[PDB]
Amino acid sequence: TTLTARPEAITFDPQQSALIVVDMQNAYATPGGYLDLAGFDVSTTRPVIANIQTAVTAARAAGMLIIWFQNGWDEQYVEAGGPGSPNFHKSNALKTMRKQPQLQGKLLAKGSWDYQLVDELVPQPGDIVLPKPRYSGFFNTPLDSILRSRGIRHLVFTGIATNVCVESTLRDGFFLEYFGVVLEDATHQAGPKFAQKAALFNIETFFGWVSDVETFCDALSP
């Protein structure tokens, strides 16, 4: 399949490709979730959910593996690292709970509403649902092994946040020799709008390719 993209069109085989849905949890996409409580704007993520539903339907019907990521930790945050880990000091979820103690245990905690995939996005049999303890899906996980075991070399990225978990996973994919394509209208940034523009610029210019959901779905039709 040829897929129109920036900076140029690319070729991939859907049977040797994977659609990655990054962290489409209430924490990242739903009012009252972690990102909203931490002061990030989540008022614009509703269209992202619908676009991911469309991309997922197309990808699955074309024989692409669907991988869903859930970012987060045990309710006691052992998996987040203690003060000896930079994640303890950088995590805005941990920072939010140190500021608002009534939140403690509620954000990015396995078994919590915050941690669940949003109600609209339901993994199907044959999909893979992967937890991850840090922003990049390629550290501390079996993601690379899962992809290699299926001979997958092309990754189609969707999800939140474009500049954080999405871009980090795509960048690390590039260093592991994966060809990464981000569907720009199926992503949303954490931060001001320039963080979306800059993430896509960095991907298009240095690390991978940028397309969109409709173009992706049209390319998969045959």
Place this chain on the structure above:
Amino acid sequence: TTLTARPEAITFDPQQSALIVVDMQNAYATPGGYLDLAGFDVSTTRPVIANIQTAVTAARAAGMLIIWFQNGWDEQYVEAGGPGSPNFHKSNALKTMRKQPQLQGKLLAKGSWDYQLVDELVPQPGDIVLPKPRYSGFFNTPLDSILRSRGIRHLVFTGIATNVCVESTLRDGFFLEYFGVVLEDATHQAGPKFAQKAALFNIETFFGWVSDVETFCDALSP
């Protein structure tokens, strides 16, 4: 030692830290080098070079290990990966040489002027000079081993490009549990100025800390 930084000050032991000078080669810093020929603005790097000189002098006097990265490949580009590698398709150096065959074998080529560190920056005995074949200094290199062997947990980053090799190495450092600081006035982006602002925003907000050369040097002065 305390280092004033954004979003807050951090503490570290300079003798358990490293100053990383990312890719201060003519390719990235000098008119007529790779980035300039590829269409990126390199006209404002003279203050970056001077500031890196100041930071290196302070770090070495404080007992901090200095690591210099040189990015590039053999002059036949075997190390850049063939058409089976995304690096072959993304590399702007390779793209430039495809358009300009006069430059074939010169950009980012070991032994060449483009690959040499800029004239002003001269590694000293005791420093480590590390070649790397991809943007991130943590993939395909002994960098992690070098740092662990010395018990180093804090990395102070300088160099080019802020949004590419610098940020990628810092992000990967974070995933390997290193505490990363970038000295903003000792870096320069590849792309429009929004790429500098966004790289610093992503680092400060999610991955590490942002400081500057004079603050860094004053922290080491005791």
